[PDB]
């Protein structure tokens, strides 16, 4: 099955995030792909929980800790390392946001 990988930003909301989850997994089921998150801690439990309860059986997370620039940046390592191919790129685009603000 495919990977479906999904974005979450530190500034959603506790609706925005559990409104992504539940429709990417309502939509990971119809495709029959699987649900890899990555984003910060609070707002991929929302997202995680939405999408188990919308009938997904699993869910991945890359957990980044945002609360500094710094380890937001040493997290984006990791995941860069871990992650297939569309995970590594997500955490690129997050390091490259973080090096200019957040």
Do not use: C, H, W
Not at 6 to 21: F, H
């Amino acid at each position: 099955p495919k990977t479906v990988v999904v974005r979450l930003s530190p500034s959603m909301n506790e609706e925005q995030a559990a409104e992504i989850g539940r429709e990417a997994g309502k939509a990971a089921l119809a495709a029959g792909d699987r649900l890899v998150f990555v984003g910060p801690a609070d707002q991929s439990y929302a997202a995680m929980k939405a999408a188990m309860e919308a009938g997904l059986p699993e869910v991945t997370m890359y957990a980044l800790d945002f609360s500094d620039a710094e380890s937001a940046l040493k997290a984006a390592e990791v995941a860069e390392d871990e992650g297939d191919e569309e995970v590594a790129e997500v955490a690129r685009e997050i390091a490259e946001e973080i090096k200019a603000g957040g």
